């Protein structure tokens, strides 16, 4: 979605917003995947 042309064309950020749910280390994530 173009954001530089905000003056001419409104961006649609409702479908661009994301939420950062969990941040885990690589080894902890590997153990969780093993589980």
């Amino acid at each position: 979605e173009s954001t530089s042309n905000s003056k001419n064309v409104p961006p649609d950020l409702s479908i661009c917003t994301f939420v950062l749910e969990q941040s885990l280390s690589v080894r902890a994530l590997q153990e969780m995947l093993a589980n």
Binding site: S25, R27, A28, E31, A34
Partner: protein
Amino acid sequence: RTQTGNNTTVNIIISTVDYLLRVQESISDFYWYYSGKDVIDEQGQRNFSKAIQVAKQVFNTLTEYIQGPCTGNQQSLAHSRLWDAVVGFLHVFAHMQMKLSQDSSQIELLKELMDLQKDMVVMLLSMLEGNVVNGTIGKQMVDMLVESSNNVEMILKFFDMFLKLKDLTSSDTFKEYDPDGKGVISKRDFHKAMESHKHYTQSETEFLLSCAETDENETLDYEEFVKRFHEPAKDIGFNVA
């Protein structure tokens, strides 16, 4: 900290803090590699011992930097990334202490780890030097404790559950089960003592039974058990208190 006369200044204190942070990550990765494995091999024990020695030396150097209320160094550490390293070491201690105590072959490693914890708490106490009531450094350490609440909880449970042992075994209620002076109490009499004290819950009961190694006669020596576990608790837990 700051070489005033020289044209260029290098922050040795911040460099030491960075090296501590790298050593913490290395130790955490090694712990994660031994997380699943029930037993630690001798080479792994040696590597843990060497890493613990290095971390202990770095902790002592950092403590010496900030003792003698060196306010500039204290502020530098407060605004540096020492807190993340302390949080990591707290998790390492809380999990490793539970893991190592169950087996009777890593008692020396447990002692080294607890000595490292003692030095870390000494560094924190040196950090708290000169703090006024409602001080910013005290606030930051409370924030760090809240961030690492679970590890602190498990460490405190560990200290509680290995400090009540001396009172339990010194109580006469424990003495009726073994009236004679041999002191070699059976596992089942141990188990009834667990519930006669009534402070030791079922989880504490099972964990101490697991951490107590017995002969083929199902009879443990409470004397060697207590001299193995209680005395180190009385030594390290004082700094936490």
